[PDB]
Structure formats: structure tokens, C-alpha cells
Design a protein around this ligand. Structure first.
Ligand SMILES: *[C@@H]1O[C@H](CO)[C@@H](O)[C@H](O)[C@H]1NC(C)=O
Ligand SMILES: *[C@@H]1O[C@H](CO)[C@@H](O)[C@H](O)[C@H]1NC(C)=O
Ligand SMILES: O=Cc1ccc([N+](=O)[O-])cc1
Lengths: 269, 269
């Protein structure tokens, strides 16, 4: 189904995403090697990959994440950590939209994601711009799992078309806003969004459609089970704004499927 | 490096051992199907397997687990759960030996596992005997992970010789007593103890040899990594009491390598 190369990328960015939780990081100076506990990110550890900038509980939304430089793969990576307790995070999830014409006209995003981002966008934009200047050749990639996925997607849409492409790899992301925003996410030039999902993950199903939310297309849907290893065959590309038949299907969703994207994520052994 | 047949058994009882933590109910009526959250025990779910008796915090050691009937595999399974928080347990783990002449002569066992078993021995042995009666041709198997493994090893050594074989499958079990016990564990008749360890898992390294502890022979050492799938080619039988070159290496250990036996164990997604 998907290519080996695109598979390799899916796997690697699943890992930089997992590293935002299990990175033995932060309070860790720039230029330290990136390493995780619990074999959470061995492909990152194999790369000559290092922190550029770490943040923990930044701005209103208490954002957490790292900016990384990878000389092996030629990347600059912005990885957003999802929540420390996904369960309570999902419990307390608020479904309010807020306006964001700044990102695109007619667009409304989950208020809280957009707000948390907005609050750190100036620091982070500057940090990325600095790294793009130092390595104009390197590919810029934003990524995150869960809440992390959300922030990476928002930051993406916000920061694109300033000259450098920004690719986004998201794993188990919630919906981030209205149908207008979803449309912009599906066409927007200057980088690709790879929206990855697994089986019946609960997180991609929130906020629900009924509250005025849509998903971008396409969807990269993993169909091998929780704790099962992923092969190229399982991954199914799915087209259509709010298309069904991937993660968006009418059955009971699952918290454990949220924590298995290529390997363990959202939690550290 | 092990047989397929033995691989399959190791895998099945890793899952019964996982079910002791992830199976939804320690007040679930006898007779109900055995199931787990988070795909922790799909070979179990796949068998006609039911609860016979569920215990929780039982006796002085606060021992938890279940006894099951498996009509597909023709087994009677006693599964001991390890500690609800392994890092703490591992931290507040006492190293004192006690006399246990009742089982082994000149053999000293760990005080807490020994007393914990001893305090629930009578009820549990009654419940196994009842199942052995009703299903005389079923294999009796005691199994456990972590503390769970210590307990199954202790219970096995204690209840053998009553006319039914008891096989023991332990996962990441600590050392359970002194050199005499190790020997008594190596040779005892009336069943087989299958002592499975993983890479540089820390628990099988405790308590230390330097507190008078010895390990029974042999050892089934899983060499494949944390979050990596196990095949029969990844298990090596190591011969000798206190053999080195399996888990018993002078390298440094790891807590995570204690939560991955064939699959996720000792924690539930
Ligand atoms: C960081 O990794 C580089 C290459 O990826 C390696 O040469 C260097 O030894 C590492 N630094 C440390 C402290 O391990
Ligand atoms: C229990 O499993 C048996 C066979 O393994 C099955 O026939 C029966 O439907 C199950 N009971 C429930 C409540 O699922
Ligand atoms: O080939 C090794 C082997 C071991 C055990 C079994 N068996 O138990 O059936 C068969 C083969």
C-alpha cells in the first residue's frame, strides 16, 4: 500500500513524537544527543540528532516539546508532546471553536489548541527560522502525537508559506477545527500533512463532528492491532474530508489503540 | 534456540500472567470468560477459558491473581499478579532470608514471598485440588510475572508431590532463596519450572547473589529487545545454577526491560 520510503518516514516521526514524552530531556542543553527510555525512539538515536531548543509548560497552554536538528536525515524537527494524562485530558476536553482568520479566512479552530499555539508561536517561529537559516537545505518537519499532533497541525497551517516547506506528521490527532479549516489543511501548498491514525483510536474521533468539527484529507490509517507490529500492507490511504472507513467508523473507540503507533507512544515504559 | 512447542507455551503463559494485571475483574463471577484490556492476552481470549476463582489482596502478603480453566488447551492455571507498582516494589524490596525446612532442607527462602505464599497456601491448594479432581487429565500450571513469578515458583515448590504434576512458568521472577533452594528448584520431581527472563531485566537480578541468593537452573533468556517481538530463535537456554551469560551479566540493568515478555506485561495500556 504505502511505499517503504514513506513507511520509514511514518516510523521515524512516530518516534520523534514518542520522544517528546520519553526523552530523557529538557533542562538538557542544546547540542545534547537525543535519547529515550524504554527503546521508545531507536531510529532517532541512530541519527546524529540533537536538541536545538527544549520547552516545558510554555505560555498559556503549558506547551511541551523540542526542536531538533538531524544531520543524518537532514531535518529540522519540531516535536510537540501530547498530554501527561491522556485519559483526564480527554475527560476535560472542551469543544469550543474560536475564530482564526489569521490562519485562513472563514476558519475556526478548537479554542485552546489555537490559543496554546498562538501563545508560543513567536518564540517557536523564531527558533525554527533560526534553524532554517543555519541549514537552508534541511527539510522542516513538525510532528506530534495526540494533543501534540494537534499543536503540530496548527503550528503548521500557521507557519506555512513563509518560504520554506513545512511537513506535518500527526499521530492520533484530534480534529482541530471547522469544515473551513479542514479544507485549507487538505489543499494548502508549501508542505504536506500526513495525518496518521490507528484502528479505533478514541482521540481522532474528538471533538465530534456534531460540535462543528471536520477532518482534513487524506488519512493514513493503520489497521494492525494494538501491540502488533506494522507493515506497509496494513497502512491504508483514505481520501475525502470527513471520510469514513478508516478511524472514523461507527464502533466503540479505545484508549489503548491511541497508544500504539508503530510502537509505544503517549507513554513510557 | 528453543523449540516451537516451548515457544508457544512460553507465549501462552506470558499472556495468562499478563491477564493477572489487565483482566477486567477480581470480583468477576466464577465461570465468566477471561478477557483483557489492550490486547494483553489474545491467546487466552482465543481459548475456551473461564475463571474458577478470583482472589485480591488475599492474606498477609496481599496476594492477587486467579485460577482458570482452559478447555481448549486442557489446563488448570493459577496466575499470580505482580505488584501494582513495580518501581516502588523494586525500591522497597526486602532482602531477608528465612528458614524453609518444610520444603527444602538447609534451604532458605525470601521472607516476604515465602510468608505471602504460606498465608494463602491452604485456600489455594484446596481450589487447585478441586479442579484436578474434576479434570483429572488437565495439566496444572502455576504462572506469574515479577512478584507473581516468585510466588508461583514458591507455590509450585510447595504443592508438588501430591500426585499431580505442577508446571511453573515464571516471567522476570526475582531470586527466591538460597543456594540450597536453587538446587532444590533445579532437581525437584513432579513438574518443570520454566524460568524466563528478558535481556537485562533488573528483577531477575534481585535480590543480589551478595545477599545469599541463588538462581535455579536452567534459565530461558529472551535476547530480543524491549518492544520487539519474540521468536523461538530469540530464546537461549542457559545451563547452571547462577549461570552468567544470560540475564546474569555484570552490565547494567533496566526497569523497562522488565515490562516486555513476548508482549506488554506488568502494566496495561
Ligand atoms: C552523540 O552522537 C554522536 C554521533 O551521532 C557521537 O559521535 C557522540 O559520541 C555522541 N555523544 C555522546 C555523549 O554520546
Ligand atoms: C465465552 O466463550 C465461549 C467459547 O470460548 C463462547 O461460546 C461464549 O459466547 C462466551 N461468553 C460470552 C459472554 O461471551
Ligand atoms: O523440535 C523440537 C520439538 C520439541 C517439542 C515438541 N513437542 O512437544 O511436540 C516437538 C518438537
Amino acid at each position: 500500500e504505502v511505499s517503504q520510503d514513506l513507511f520509514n518516514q511514518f516510523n521515524l516521526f512516530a518516534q520523534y513524537s514518542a520522544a517528546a514524552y520519553c526523552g530523557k530531556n529538557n533542562d538538557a542543553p542544546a547540542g545534547t544527543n537525543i535519547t529515550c527510555t524504554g527503546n521508545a525512539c531507536p531510529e532517532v538515536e541512530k541519527a546524529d540528532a540533537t536538541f536545538l531548543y527544549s520547552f516545558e509548560d510554555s505560555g498559556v497552554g503549558d506547551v511541551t516539546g523540542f526542536l531538533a536538528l538531524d544531520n543524518t536525515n537532514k531535518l529540522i524537527v519540531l516535536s510537540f508532546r501530547g498530554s501527561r494524562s491522556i485519559e483526564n485530558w480527554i475527560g476535560n476536553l472542551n469543544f469550543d471553536l474560536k475564530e482564526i482568520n489569521d490562519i485562513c479566512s472563514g476558519c475556526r479552530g478548537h479554542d485552546g489548541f489555537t490559543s496554546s499555539w498562538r501563545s508560543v508561536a513567536d518564540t517557536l517561529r523564531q527558533k525554527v527560522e533560526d534553524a532554517v537559516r543555519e541549514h537552508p537545505d534541511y527539510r522542516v518537519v513538525f510532528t506530534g502525537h495526540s494533543l501534540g499532533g494537534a499543536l503540530a497541525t496548527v503550528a503548521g497551517a500557521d507557519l506555512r508559506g513563509n518560504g520554506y516547506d513545512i511537513d506535518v506528521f500527526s499521530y492520533g490527532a484530534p480534529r482541530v477545527g471547522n469544515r473551513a479549516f479542514a479544507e485549507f489543511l487538505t489543499v494548502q501548498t508549501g508542505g504536506t500533512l500526513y495525518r496518521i491514525t490507528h484502528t479505533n483510536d478514541i482521540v481522532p474521533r474528538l471533538p465530534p463532528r456534531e460540535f462543528g468539527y471536520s477532518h482534513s484529507s487524506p488519512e493514513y490509517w493503520i489497521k494492525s492491532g494494538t501491540l502488533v507490529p506494522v507493515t506497509r500492507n496494513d497502512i491504508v490511504k483514505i481520501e475525502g474530508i470527513d471520510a469514513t472507513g478508516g478511524n472514523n467508523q461507527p464502533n466503540i473507540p479505545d484508549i489503548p489503540a491511541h497508544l500504539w503507533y508503530f510502537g509505544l507512544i503517549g507513554t513510557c515504559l
